[PDB]
Amino acid sequence: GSSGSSGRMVGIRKTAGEHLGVTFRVEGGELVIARILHGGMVAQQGLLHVGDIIKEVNGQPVGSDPRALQELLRNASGSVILKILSGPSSG
């Protein structure tokens, strides 16, 4: 009925070490999934897709460091949350 949630909390069933397989880019000041590799987590899920904008993760700032983010997940075992948001991403 009454929707009370911002962005979009995406739940991942990844395991310690398990990598995602994606590339984020910094344009304008936001982390956007530059590209997504097939045969992986994101791909399979089908949820995330090029253009996805990340703001916060499990209550932590992703910052403008995409190379550091892809590493944060690598060490994220259990139900991980990702707050995504839309934008100018053409499509």
From Swiss-Prot:
It is found in: Cytoplasm, Cytoskeleton; Membrane; Cell projection, Dendrite; Postsynaptic density. It comes from the Eukaryota. Residues 30-85 form the PDZ domain. Transmembrane segments: none annotated. Phosphorylated by SRC. Belongs to the MAGUK family. Can homomultimerise. Interacts with CACNG2. Interacts (via the SH3-Guanylate kinase-like sub-module) with DLG4/PSD95 and DLGAP1/GKAP. Interacts (via the PDZ domain) with CADM1 (via C-terminus). Interacts with KCNN2/SK2 (via N-terminal domain). Interacts with SRC. Postsynaptic MAGUK scaffold protein that links CADM1 cell adhesion molecules to core components of the postsynaptic density. In CA1 pyramidal neurons, required for synaptic KCNN2-containing channel function and long-term potentiation expression. Seems to negatively regulate SRC function in epithelial cells. This is MAGUK p55 subfamily member 2. It comes from Homo sapiens. The gene is MPP2.
